[PDB]
Amino acid sequence: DYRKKLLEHKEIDGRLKELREQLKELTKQYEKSENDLKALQSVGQIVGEVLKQLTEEKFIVKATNGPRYVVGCRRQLDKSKLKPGTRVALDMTTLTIMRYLPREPKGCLLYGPPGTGKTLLARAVASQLDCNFLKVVSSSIVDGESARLIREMFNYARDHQPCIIFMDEIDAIGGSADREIQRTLMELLNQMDGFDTLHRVKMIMATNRPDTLDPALLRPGRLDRKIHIDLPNEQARLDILKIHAGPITKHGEIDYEAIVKLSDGFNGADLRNVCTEAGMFAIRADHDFVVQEDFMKAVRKVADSKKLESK
Amino acid sequence: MADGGSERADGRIVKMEVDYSATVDQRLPECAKLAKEGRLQEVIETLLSLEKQTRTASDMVSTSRILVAVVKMCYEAKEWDLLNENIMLLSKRRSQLKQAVAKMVQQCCTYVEEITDLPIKLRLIDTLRMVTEGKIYVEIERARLTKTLATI
Amino acid sequence: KIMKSEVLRVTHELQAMKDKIKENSEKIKVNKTLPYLVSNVIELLDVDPQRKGKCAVIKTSTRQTYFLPVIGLVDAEKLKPGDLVGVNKDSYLILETLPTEYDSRVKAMEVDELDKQIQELVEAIVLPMNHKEKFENLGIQPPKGVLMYGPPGTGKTLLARACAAQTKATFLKLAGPQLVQMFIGDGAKLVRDAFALAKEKAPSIIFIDELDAIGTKRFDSEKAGDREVQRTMLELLNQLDGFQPNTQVKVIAATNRVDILDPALLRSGRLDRKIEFPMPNEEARARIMQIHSRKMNVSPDVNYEELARCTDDFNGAQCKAVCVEAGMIALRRGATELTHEDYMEGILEVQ
């Protein structure tokens, strides 16, 4: 009789202490609201730019709207960032300064004639680390006024030290109509063989066939290494097949060895589409479970169709 | 396609047992055109993973009982890129070469303990020059041969 | 339960908080109710050396640049270089950010409120709005890009438009030449804006046509006017590949001629379904024509043989045009009910 009261009181105290999580969690957000309300107290800041400076303590500022003014020096900030050539900020009162306003294997060759899926690997690396997010279009020309645009992009590449370049379908630009093309090529040569540090920035090129790819431009100089991908690796294909077999339940007896072995000259995304097509083919039998027999047949047929349409 | 070369390979391993190196010399023009053809990169991988094993098997037979080793090293010394001379198109496989050199240095590793005194210094003085002449490698076997030479 | 007696005080403090937030939550409504103008916001990351560096770049419609950090309530879809933000007098702060897109005009393109193949098509367009709940157990990933093509004379345009009515969702209209303009660099803006509207709005239906003409890679090396939609398509595929949001609303593409095809269009996110039309039959066209004409008043005696036989290499819109033409002279015939011979008469009339 006395032993059950402890359990009962444990239940009451339990449901009493379990109702706090519906409050104390959102109280932090409610407090954060007023915190933001107190964070909105700072207003009336304007901008400015520094050109000429006479006195080290007090310099001249240039507004974006075009009128010119002069300000002093705040006891907080130092003379380190006070140097000219840096866009700063100003206040509507006393024209003080809260802070400033900052402005905003060296090569590889990938040729894809047997199929595709290199972009899937590049996407895998990009989703892995990639050190940054950047993409270079195949043709920046149609966007002779694109030269300054290329030099601008490379200027940004010099601005941000870490860089990785991804270029897909470069065989299009690899091929007075031809004269301007040759001129653009000469510009590319001038830019790549100019003065720059390639030990950091990395470039990746994706393409189709080794014809318009300019083997002279595929030279060791303008491209260190070349890697040929015929198809995803056996371990890689098995792995991606395993992770694609995760959400879909199958029969107790399962063999991926047949699926992997019978697959020749196929691509990951394509094979995934074949798998989904096999699922939609096996959904016609309205069964919750699907044997690998129908899977093997459907995969075989669909892949054969893809081989017939591979032209 | 390597399907035709496979029959030649597994036929070769059966037909070649007690025969001398003359049959290999007769096998040279046969393997020459075989190296000339097969433009396909992926297809002939098997053929390159077979025929090489066959000729190295013949080399094993020649190095089994009686070995002059002069002609053996002279053949490879005189012929390196000779098979690739007729082909203007760049092979750029960079696949079977590693396994090739690894197998060669594997056999050389089996013979590295005790065989005979004279040929080994010639083989080493040849391959250390091959390191320089090659200029492209995974930089494994190249260090292997020279460090295993250094140990001596 | 003597140790749990201190919880009551905590609850009293919490309800006291709920009582004391009434005023500060009340002033929000009267303060933020009327932003006086609209300014452009550009996000720029600064560095203070908590004291974490935070800033932003503002552009007023009066062309006056000011200074201000990133503030306001909890942000989710914010921090993007959009427009239409709430601002008070002299404060230049950010309260409510709503995206209406940029240069609206492209967006208001249009407002819209063979059995074996059309069955597969209907199932295909229905399943992403249906089987999503069953896609967890079955693990079936729905295709995104769907390529609908075939020989000229099919009438697939108004057929897909008819399926759009079956989807019950909103339908949009975008053509090939619509992507070609006098300006430059329009592709990226168009794609990003379209995906923005697709992100903000309901899972509507998007259908584009003539991807073959604007996707021509021009084997001939001499000259041509449009290289733009090529890289626009490349960028489209890039965003349909390297982006997780691509699981969102699908984009349907169609090509008239098979002469030009891009091998890189094969993917789940990209074009997947490929259906060739092998000289579509007659009786089916008669069936859909019956479905279309079932509303109008017609004498219920039809052999269907003559009208099925007289139709050769004709669109669906051309069949509807045959129906309309049949309704044209039926008005001046004096008859209040459409007859059988009027159909074939219309066929021999307009065609």
Swiss-Prot record, chain A:
Keywords: Acetylation, ATP-binding, Cytoplasm, Nucleotide-binding, Nucleus, Phosphoprotein, Proteasome. GO terms for biological process: ERAD pathway; positive regulation of inclusion body assembly; positive regulation of proteasomal protein catabolic process; positive regulation of RNA polymerase II transcription preinitiation complex assembly; proteasome-mediated ubiquitin-dependent protein catabolic process. The modification N6-acetyllysine is found at K62. It comes from the Eukaryota. The keyword 4Fe-4S does not apply. It is found in: Cytoplasm; Nucleus. ATP binds at G112, P113, P114, G115, T116, G117, K118, T119. Gene3D superfamilies: 1.10.8.60, Nucleic acid-binding proteins, P-loop containing nucleotide triphosphate hydrolases. GO terms for molecular function: ATP binding; ATP hydrolysis activity; identical protein binding; proteasome-activating activity; protein-macromolecule adaptor activity. GO terms for cellular component: cytosol; cytosolic proteasome complex; extracellular exosome; inclusion body; membrane; nucleoplasm; nucleus; proteasome accessory complex. SUPFAM superfamilies: P-loop containing nucleoside triphosphate hydrolases. CDD domains: RecA-like_PAN_like (cd19502). Its main location: cytoplasm. Component of the 19S proteasome regulatory particle complex. The 26S proteasome consists of a 20S core particle (CP) and two 19S regulatory subunits (RP). The regulatory particle is made of a lid composed of 9 subunits, a base containing 6 ATPases including PSMC6 and few additional components. Interacts with PAAF1. Belongs to the AAA ATPase family. PANTHER family: 26S PROTEASOME REGULATORY SUBUNIT. This is 26S proteasome regulatory subunit 10B. It comes from Homo sapiens.
UniProtKB/Swiss-Prot annotation, chain B:
The modification N-acetylalanine is found at A2. It comes from the Eukaryota. There is a cross-link at K92 (Glycyl lysine isopeptide (Lys-Gly) (interchain with G-Cter in SUMO1)). There is a cross-link at K92 (Glycyl lysine isopeptide (Lys-Gly) (interchain with G-Cter in SUMO2)). Coiled coil: none annotated. Disulfide bonds: none annotated. Component of the 26S proteasome, a multiprotein complex involved in the ATP-dependent degradation of ubiquitinated proteins. This complex plays a key role in the maintenance of protein homeostasis by removing misfolded or damaged proteins, which could impair cellular functions, and by removing proteins whose functions are no longer required. Therefore, the proteasome participates in numerous cellular processes, including cell cycle progression, apoptosis, or DNA damage repair. It is linked to Stankiewicz-Isidor syndrome: A neurodevelopmental disorder characterized by delayed psychomotor development, intellectual disability, behavioral disorders, mild dysmorphism, ophthalmologic anomalies, feeding difficulties, deafness, and variable congenital malformations of the cardiac and/or urogenital systems. Belongs to the proteasome subunit p55 family. Component of the 19S proteasome regulatory particle complex. The 26S proteasome consists of a 20S core particle (CP) and two 19S regulatory subunits (RP). The regulatory particle is made of a lid composed of 9 subunits including PSMD12, a base containing 6 ATPases and few additional components. Interacts with ERCC6. This is 26S proteasome non-ATPase regulatory subunit 12. The gene is PSMD12.
Curated annotation (Swiss-Prot), chain C:
The gene is PSMC3. One of its GO terms (molecular function) is ATP binding. It is found in: Cytoplasm; Nucleus. It comes from the Eukaryota. Component of the 26S proteasome, a multiprotein complex involved in the ATP-dependent degradation of ubiquitinated proteins. This complex plays a key role in the maintenance of protein homeostasis by removing misfolded or damaged proteins, which could impair cellular functions, and by removing proteins whose functions are no longer required. Therefore, the proteasome participates in numerous cellular processes, including cell cycle progression, apoptosis, or DNA damage repair. Pfam families: AAA (PF00004), AAA_lid_3 (PF17862), Prot_ATP_ID_OB_C (PF16450). Keywords: Acetylation, ATP-binding, Cataract, Cytoplasm, Deafness, Host-virus interaction, Intellectual disability, Neuropathy, Nucleotide-binding, Nucleus, Phosphoprotein, Proteasome, Ubl conjugation. This is 26S proteasome regulatory subunit 6A.
